[PDB]
Chain A
Amino acid sequence: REILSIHVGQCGNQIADSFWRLALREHGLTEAGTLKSNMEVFFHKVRDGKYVPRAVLVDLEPGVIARIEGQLFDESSIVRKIPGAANNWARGYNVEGEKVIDQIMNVIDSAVEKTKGLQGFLMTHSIGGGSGSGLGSLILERLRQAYPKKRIFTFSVVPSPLISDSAVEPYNAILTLQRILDNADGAVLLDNEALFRIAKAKLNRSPNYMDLNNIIALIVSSVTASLRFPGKLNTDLSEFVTNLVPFPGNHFLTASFAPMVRTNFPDLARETFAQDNFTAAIDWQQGVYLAASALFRGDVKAKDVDENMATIRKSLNYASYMPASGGLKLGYAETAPEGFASSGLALVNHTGIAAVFERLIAQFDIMFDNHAYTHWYENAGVSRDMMAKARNQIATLAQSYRDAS
């Protein structure tokens, strides 16, 4: 019952920013850690008012970590590394990754050596970067091989379909998703344009990344809500692995939070499992649900949760191997985020997230055949053969989803 959070990259670090901005007052503390329901799973005991979130903000070209420290973290565990991230996965893996992995894993095993008992890791990053992609992949590699009995969860922002912020980001995405496969037993994928449209629906003016990462932060908070807010029908990360991962390598999740508030519970539950409310733009029409976890929290009523079966027997489409009334991991938590009397999270193992994967595949299917940006990898130590086999693994995973329909 302890969480070590890993934050690599600018996107992952802003996700972490918003994540603790809401997690601190979700337990009644300010952003700086001052006191204004076992909340010690995320936080280490340092001072009676300062409950320190032990999360490593390791990131090449730090830049943003300065504005992170301006909300107080543990300054010893985090590092503002010498810059030079670029958007190269190999540059975060073996060029400058090899000169930071010893220090970051010394920090990590010092953080977990003082742990009474650990459940796993929740890493927030973006697969499309160069720091959060390559450094995250290296951390996954040397963290699975160090603690094979622990359960790494990755909250990765997949690059947007409509427009791109990096010109080599599908290379990075695929060659980090391969490491997420080979090194983690759980993954929640985030898509940016879905977050933009959700925040457009939620608010009345134009949002930005801070609102998107607030939504992502609500997602991550409700992921572990049943673990740190013990009510009835508790949920654990081991339970997430057991009942959301039907096959050994199929552990990529799409997440929706509701509402977007003294709302009527049927509306909250039917809008929680809404095809347009999920935070990753995945394939719903042709896709089906493998394993949906409904984690409701706050002013939730057990009969209300269990009687909202209209949205499951009407809107939710399941695979052939799951029972019609099954496919639900139900969870109750006594505490919901503020502004919500009762709120809900849908964590779905779904076929349509493979569509997410395949769009990166599509980009890789046009770049590798044209020798597009591969010299940036070859001169950095990552050859074309390992990129090809990483894409082969990712395509096999997407085909596993397509076969699991």
Chain B
Amino acid sequence: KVNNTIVVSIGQAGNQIAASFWKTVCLEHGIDPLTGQTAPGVAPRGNWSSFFSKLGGSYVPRAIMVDLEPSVIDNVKATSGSLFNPANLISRTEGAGGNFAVGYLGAGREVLPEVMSRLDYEIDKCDNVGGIIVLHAIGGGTGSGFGALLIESLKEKYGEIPVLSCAVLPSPQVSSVVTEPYNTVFALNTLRRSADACLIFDNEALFDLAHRKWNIESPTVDDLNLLITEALAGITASMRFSGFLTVEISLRELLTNLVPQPSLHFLMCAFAPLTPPIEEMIKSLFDNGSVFAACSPMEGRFLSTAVLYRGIMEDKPLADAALAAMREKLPLTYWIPTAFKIGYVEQPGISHRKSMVLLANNTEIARVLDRICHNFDKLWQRKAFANWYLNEGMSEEQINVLRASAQELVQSYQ
């Protein structure tokens, strides 16, 4: 048995990214995603019990889906079939609608007991949970509100359990919700208080990564979540594959290696190669635009990077030397000289026979949140859209506390 990880998805981006994530993970294992049952005559490739469960049986994902509107859960069920347990799927009617307070003080309180009963059921089937991946978009309403409530309730009940968040930020090219700054900061406070780690995506970066560097004139959001999915598959392959040359990295292991300080737990991600299905691949992993966040991390400062190679390894001394040489011309924190976790996995992805994933801790990510905070400086300098936040249950002083906590995070990074 291997250390476990449950991936709870909240909000529309979280649920669709979860659909794509378990799709690609299942087809990595050789399991049909649209059915949830293993392929006859083929064993699951790697440590399935880290993210799955043999429910009698079927290799069902250990995923919990909550969303306050039926549309996303129904669409995920249509695109995934019987992959997820219907007991794991909880839906409401009115939605949160870009309002964090609905997910925090409102329908969030109503939907919390059922979600936590299901989470207790799932964790009681876990051998040793060493991480909870919260797939959500903190720009959205349901995602922010119930992610905040859910991580707060986890750290109130549990707290020996690492929590890795995977939050989709509002894009700097365009906002999808105008209350994205409110929701992002409101969930970000609880992420810093409760979540032990947070992985950050951004749609514009994935768009430019899948437009010219995937040879698609105009990708859909499906390609967005597929790129995010390749990132997550590479990240969790450390928690998913074990063997001789490969090193097994628990989510608590990845946490202890990637999170130096308790408030320093926000991570960027990148993928190589950037080609449609070696040194040029090394630099492709570490280009200025290879990260999955609309920012330039190479003027930032890598705190610690988990570089997870996966595939055939025909140049192990040569690739280690290439990584060491590449480290010389990268911005690393002096106070973490051992800022590289060179994780290896023998099994590659399905799209590529040879891939790597960068999972780094960088100060640059804070300035990313800073621009969202800058957007927060627009919605609260004039007291806009906050009437429903106050009416749904929250308070203005509480919101000032939340914004001060976000600023405390950004100043903790720099």
Give me the interface of A with B, judged by CB distance under 8 Å: 10, 14, 17, 61, 63-64, 66-67, 80, 82-88, 130, 159-160, 162-170, 193, 196-197, 200, 206-210, 362-363, 366-367, 369-373, 375-376
**Pairs across A and B, CB under 8 Å, 6 listed:** A61-B253, A84-B128, A193-B317, A196-B320, A367-B335, A369-B335
B52 to chain A, nearest CB (A): 15
Residue in A207, A366, A371, A373 whose beta carbon sits within 8 Å of that of B256 in the complex = A373
**Interchain nearest-CB distance for B302 vs A (Å):** 11
Tell me whether B130 is interfacial, beta carbon within 8 Å.
Answer: yes
Residue pair A61, B316 in contact (C-beta under 8 Å): no
Across the interface, name the chain B residue whose C-beta is closest to A171.
Answer: B338
Q: Please tell me if the beta carbons of B320 and A86 are within 8 angstroms of each other in the complex.
A: no
Question: Do A61 and B244 touch (CB < 8 A)?
Answer: no
CB-CB under 8 A from A207, the residues of chain B are 316-317
The 7 closest A-B pairs by CB, nearest first: A63-B242, A370-B335, A83-B3, A167-B257, A164-B338, A63-B248, A196-B317
Contacts A82-B1, A83-B2, A85-B253 given; does A61 touch B248 at CB 8 Å:
yes
Given contacts A61-B2, A209-B245, A210-B244, contact A166 B262 (CB under 8 A): no
User: Does B314 reach chain A (CB closer than 8 Å)?
Assistant: yes
CA distance A229 to B342 in the complex (A): 40
A86 touches B314 (CB 8 A): no
B30 at the interface (CB under 8 A from A): no
B residues less than 8 Å from A208 (CB atoms): 245, 313, 316
A165 and B256 in contact (CB under 8 A), knowing A363-B338, A366-B337? no
- Give the complex CA separation of A206 and B314 in angstroms: 6
Given contacts A63-B2, A63-B248, A366-B337, contact A163 B342 (CB under 8 A): yes
User: B236-272 CB contact bits vs A (8 Å, 1 = yes)?
Assistant: 0000001111011010110111101110000000000
Chain A residues lying within 8 Å of B250, measured Cβ to Cβ, are 61, 83-86
A169-B339 Cα distance, complex, nearest whole Å? 10
Q: Distance (Å) between the CB of A69 and the closest chain B CB?
A: 13
Given A61-B3, A162-B320, list of 6 further CB < 8 A pairs?
Answer: A10-B247, A67-B244, A85-B253, A162-B324, A163-B324, A208-B245
B304 sits at the interface (CB 8 A): yes
Cα A88 to Cα B248 in complex, Å, equals: 14
CB distance from A154 to the nearest CB of B (A): 21
Q: In the complex, are the beta carbons of B253 and A87 less than 8 A apart?
A: yes
Select which of B244, B256, B318, B342 is within 8 A of A168 by beta carbon.
B256
Establish whether residues A84 and B242, one from each chain, have CB atoms under 8 Å apart when the complex forms. no
A165 to B261, Cβ gap below 8 A?
no
Residues of B within 8 A of A166 (CB): 257, 338, 341
Q: Given A83-B1, A84-B252, A206-B315, A169–B338 Cβ distance below 8 Å?
A: yes
Q: Assess whether B292 is interfacial by the CB under 8 Å rule.
A: no
Could you tell me the distance between the alpha carbons of A209 and B317 in the complex, rounded to whole angstroms?
10
Partner of B248, one of A10, A163, A197: A10
B34 proximal to A (CB < 8 A): no
* B327-A86 in contact (CB<8A): no
Assembled-state Cα–Cα distance A362/B318 (Å): 26
**Chain B residues with CB under 8 A of A130:** 253, 256
- Across the interface, which residues of B come within 8 angstroms of A369, CB to CB? 335
Q: Which residues of the other chain, A, contact B2 by a CB distance below 8 angstroms?
A: 61, 63, 83
Q: How far is the CA of A362 from the CA of B306 in the complex (A)?
A: 22
Q: How far is the CB of A100 from chain B (nearest CB, A)?
A: 13
Nearest Cβ on chain B to A347's Cβ, whole angstroms: 25
Query: Per-position contact with A for B284-327: 1 when CB-CB < 8 Å, else 0?
Result: 00000000000000000000101000000111111011011001
Residue of A nearest to B318 (CB): A206
- Which positions 95-109 of chain B face chain A at CB distance < 8 Å? none
Q: Give the contacting residue for A84; candidates B130, B247, B335, B342; CB below 8 A.
A: B130
B190 on interface, CB distance cutoff 8 Å: no
How many Å lie between the Cα of A168 and that of B335 in the bound state?
11
For A67, list chain B residues within 8 Å (CB).
242-244
Residue B59 at the A interface, CB < 8 A? Answer: no
Q: Are B338 and A159 in contact (CB under 8 A)?
A: yes
**Residues of B close to A162: CB separation below 8 A:** 320-321, 324
User: Closest residue to A14 on the B side, CB-wise?
Assistant: B244
Q: A85-B250, A167-B338, A367-B335 are in contact. Are A197 and B256 (CB under 8 A)?
A: no
Residues in A with CB closer than 8 Å to B321 are: 162-163
Report whether B339 and A167 are in contact in the complex, using a CB–CB cutoff of 8 Å: yes
Inter-chain contacts of B261 with A (CB < 8 A): 371-372, 375
Alpha-carbon gap, A85 to B323, bound state (A): 26
Residues of A within 8 A of B158 (CB): none
Which residues of A lie under 8 Å from residue B20 when comparing CB positions? none
Give Cα A61–Cα B128 distance, bound, in whole angstroms: 10
Tell me the minimal C-beta distance from A98 to chain B in angstroms. Answer: 15
* Closest B residue, CB atoms, query A192: B320
